[PDB]
């Protein structure tokens, strides 16, 4: 389903976090760079651990 009752699951990568635009298109922003993107970035952007990598 939607699972339009919880945002909780998992499903982006920390600092992601998932909004709707005007359009209905959802879209993914980090909160850490500051990017909106309107594209999945689980692609190849897989997280090794989460520590203090630089």
Do not use: C, M
């Amino acid at each position: 389903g939607s699972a339009k009752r919880k945002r909780v699951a998992g499903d982006l990568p920390y600092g992601w976090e998932q909004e709707t635009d005007e359009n209905g298109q959802v879209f993914f922003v980090d909160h850490i760079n500051k990017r909106t993107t309107y594209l999945d970035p689980r692609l190849a952007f897989t997280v090794d651990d989460n520590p203090t990598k630089p």
